[PDB]
């Protein structure tokens, strides 16, 4: 698959986040317990709540599509559907909102992805959400200064950075430690205090943010100079226009 036209680093980065054959760079290590704590849906050692009984207990009617399509593990169990949501700064965060939803529906099964300017969300079955969430938090999808895990109060994608290079957060869920140069998560994604903070590692430096970003800007690579990506957008406009007419 081709994924996206263009000859910039931004274009290639958009293709790499979509391509399931591209190995996302891992930047930090987070424990399973700390992914559960950041998500905030259940406490460590709480059983997965259910929204319906296990599929085995249901004995449903003959349907060729059900038989052909393997359920994800949380669907076999009857798990709740829960979410994780991220905000990405326009000052060169590595992932950005459409890049996430496009990549999530190439990489992940059984996924409900939504894109907005100031937030991007995926909803799926709880135990599968915890597996995906580890990868979204540990890899270059995430930078702890220019991206934020936020289930509400998302403002900040379009704000100026603070003096530490951190994006704004009304609820201050991610705190930069000047003594280590590392960010801690001090609250879960909906803003409740964690018993113990989670280390999210060091912010990427400016050179590495420029290498990895998927936003086009005049002070990085401008979209108007990726003339092959603009050509395909304009072609889609003209072909939709002519199709709707005749």
């Amino acid at each position: 698959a081709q994924y996206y036209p263009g000859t910039t680093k931004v274009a290639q980065n958009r293709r790499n986040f979509c391509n399931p054959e591209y190995e996302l760079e891992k930047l930090r290590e987070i424990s399973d317990e700390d992914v559960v704590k950041i998500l905030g849906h259940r406490a460590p050692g709480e059983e997965y709540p259910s929204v319906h009984p296990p599929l085995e207990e249901m004995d449903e009617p003959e349907d060729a599509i059900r038989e052909m399509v393997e359920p994800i593990d949380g669907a076999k169990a009857g798990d709740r559907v829960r979410y994780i949501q991220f905000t990405d700064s326009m000052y060169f965060a590595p992932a950005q909102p459409y890049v996430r939803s496009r990549a999530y529906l190439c990489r992940y099964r059984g996924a409900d992805a939504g894109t907005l300017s100031g937030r991007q969300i995926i909803e799926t079955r709880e135990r599968d959400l915890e597996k995906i969430s580890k990868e979204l938090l540990e890899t270059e999808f995430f930078d702890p200064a220019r991206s934020g895990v936020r289930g509400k109060s998302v403002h900040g994608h379009s704000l100026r950075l603070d003096e530490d290079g951190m994006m704004f957060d009304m609820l201050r869920r991610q705190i930069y430690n000047k003594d280590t140069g590392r960010v801690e998560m001090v609250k879960n994604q909906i803003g409740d205090e964690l018993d113990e903070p989670v280390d999210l590692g060091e912010p990427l430096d400016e050179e590495t943010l420029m290498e990895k970003t998927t936003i086009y800007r005049v002070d990085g690579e401008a979209y108007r100079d990726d003339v092959e990506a603009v050509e395909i957008m304009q072609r889609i406009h003209v072909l939709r226009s002519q199709g709707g007419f005749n």
Binding site: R14, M90, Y91, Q96, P97, Y98, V99, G114, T115, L116, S117, G118, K152, S153, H155, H157, S158, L159, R160, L161, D162, E163, F168, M170, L171, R172, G191, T214, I215, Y216, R217, V218, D219, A222, Y223, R224, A229, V230, M233, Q234, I236, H237, V238, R240, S241, G243, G244, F245
Partner: protein
């Protein structure tokens, strides 16, 4: 000279507008704001008087971790917090909608035919003046025939009246001029000659019912109220029996055969009668706004006064209250009429088109769409990239999408002289913006945007329509903020560049050329600023009939 938004950015923030870094969390939350402090005090007084908790700044999350900004009303020097631009807190915005809701245009052409041909009586300018004196007694709610009538208090209904207009200058000048909208006084010469040619010898009433009645009731009351009092005044002024068979022809003519509503009724999921905001087509909204007859030398100013009119009515009152409610959609609309931002981007595009093509001289085709809409979209988006304070000001992607695309679509239509290629340029702008920044608006912003290119030039049943005829009930536009008031501006844009006196209905254009209206439609952004300052005096209040 500086970009037009620079002065406002310097007023909002201590940093220069190009600076990438700032300070948060040290402003004391809501205590930084004069307006939030007035609200906290008022919430304590309301809850104490009524015995039920109400506004409390500590419920939910704490506003003002960043600067709570003032906004410049564009074209003015007035800076207010955005709460003063919420329609609930702005009497000028409420009156603008009351003045539209309570107006209806009603012909006298069928009526005068009924008098001549069925009653066998003559109509002259003198009989028309006698009828107009009678209907300006009756229209606010006073009696002309029966004994023991009980009536409306004249000072509660002082804003209700009837005027007329005609394209025949010598007939206009014979009717008493207290009742006449004088086309030659209100319009520059070339636009007056266009409008009088459209009207010809036709004679039309502009009827405004009382704001206190329109607030108590609804828009669909307007043409009924108008017709009842036209009917009573035709009985009294032409000496009919008070209720004979011919009386029914004046009722059918005033309520159906020669009435022009400002809005048509809506389908049942969003059920509403006539004269509600969702029925007002975009070309009528551009014609209600009166910027065209005052600022005709400057097509940008005329187009962006129509955007201000439509962004406030369609996003703040219609989508933000009739179709939702709550805190609502103030800043989805303010982005199109504050800080001189849309103004900077649309003057850029006008100058671009003047240099490359000349206004209205470009070919009306896709090559022009691709050229102008792309150039203007990249100018607007570069401004948010070059000025971090501009991006923190227009913080929501929907706000930026509507502002950039409005400049791109208005500038395409300045080049082609045709609103349909303007509208194709609006959609191309959204597609380029979405790929540039990897984001566009809120979750549901581009429903119409993605249907948009294919439906611009479609001819199918519920798809195909010239932009001037579309409105908030065109199917793809029925739900979402950040489009409808910008489409009214794109519908105005080619006609302002052409010097056309109107966009879609010459009778609607003349009907708002009247300084007896309570809101001043020639200076919509000025009036929004006056209401924000708590300096506007609305009609409809009950002070006369309540305790002192």
């Amino acid at each position: 000279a500086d970009k037009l938004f620079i002065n406002a950015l310097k007023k909002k923030f201590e940093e220069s507008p190009e600076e990438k870094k700032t300070t948060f969390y040290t402003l004391g939350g809501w205590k930084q704001s004069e307006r939030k402090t007035e609200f906290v005090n008022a919430g304590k007084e309301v809850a104490a008087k009524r015995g039920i908790p109400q506004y409390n700044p500590d419920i939910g999350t704490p506003l003002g971790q960043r600067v709570l900004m003032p906004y410049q009303v564009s074209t003015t020097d007035t800076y207010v917090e955005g709460d003063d631009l919420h329609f609930v807190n702005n009497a000028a915005m409420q009156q603008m909608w009351d003045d539209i809701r309570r107006t209806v245009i009603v012909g006298l052409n069928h009526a005068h035919a009924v008098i001549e041909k069925r009653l066998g009586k003559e109509v002259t300018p003198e009989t028309i003046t006698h009828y107009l004196e009678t209907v300006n007694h009756a229209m606010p709610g006073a009696a002309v025939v029966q004994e023991h009538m009980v009536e409306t208090h004249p000072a509660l209904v002082a804003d209700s009246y009837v005027k007329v207009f005609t394209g025949n200058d010598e007939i206009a000048d014979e009717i008493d001029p207290a009742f006449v909208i004088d086309i030659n006084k209100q319009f520059p010469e070339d636009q007056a000659e266009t409008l009088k040619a459209e009207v010809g010898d036709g004679i039309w009433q502009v009827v405004r019912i009382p704001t206190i009645v329109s607030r108590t009731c609804d828009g669909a009351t307007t043409s009924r109220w108008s017709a009842m009092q036209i009917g009573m005044s035709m009985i009294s002024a032409y000496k009919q029996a008070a209720g004979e068979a011919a009386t029914g022809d004046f009722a059918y003519a005033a309520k159906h055969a020669e009435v022009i509503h400002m809005g048509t009724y809506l389908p049942v999921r969003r059920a509403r009668g006539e004269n509600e905001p969702g029925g007002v087509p975009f070309g009528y909204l551009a014609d209600i706004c009166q910027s065209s007859r005052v600022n005709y030398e400057d097509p940008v100013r005329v187009s962006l006064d129509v955007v201000a009119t439509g962004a406030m009515l369609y996003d703040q009152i219609w989508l933000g209250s009739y179709m939702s409610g709550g805190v609502g959609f103030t800043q989805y609309a303010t982005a199109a009429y504050t800080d001189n931002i849309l103004d900077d981007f649309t003057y850029f595009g006008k100058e671009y088109v003047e240099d490359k093509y000349g206004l209205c001289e470009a070919p009306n085709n896709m090559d022009t769409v691709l050229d102008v809409a792309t150039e203007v979209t990249f100018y607007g988006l570069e401004q948010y990239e070059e000025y971090p304070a501009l991006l923190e000001d227009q913080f929501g992607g929907s706000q930026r999408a509507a502002v950039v695309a409005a400049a791109a679509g208005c500038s395409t239509a300045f080049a082609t002289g045709n609103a349909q290629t303007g509208l194709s340029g609006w959609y191309l702008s959204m597609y380029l913006h979405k790929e540039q920044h990897s984001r566009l608006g809120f979750y549901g912003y581009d429903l119409q945007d993605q249907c948009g290119a294919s439906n611009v030039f479609s001819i199918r049943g519920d798809e195909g329509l010239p932009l001037e005829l579309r409105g908030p009930n065109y199917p793809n536009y029925a739900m979402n903020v950040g489009h409808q008031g910008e489409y009214a501006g794109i519908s105005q844009a080619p006609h302002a560049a052409r010097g056309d006196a109107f966009v879609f209905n010459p009778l609607v254009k003349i009907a708002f050329a009247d300084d007896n209206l309570v809101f001043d439609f020639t200076n919509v952004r000025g009036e929004f600023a006056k209401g924000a300052l708590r300096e506007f005096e609305p009609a409809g209040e009950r002070a006369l009939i309540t305790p002192a």
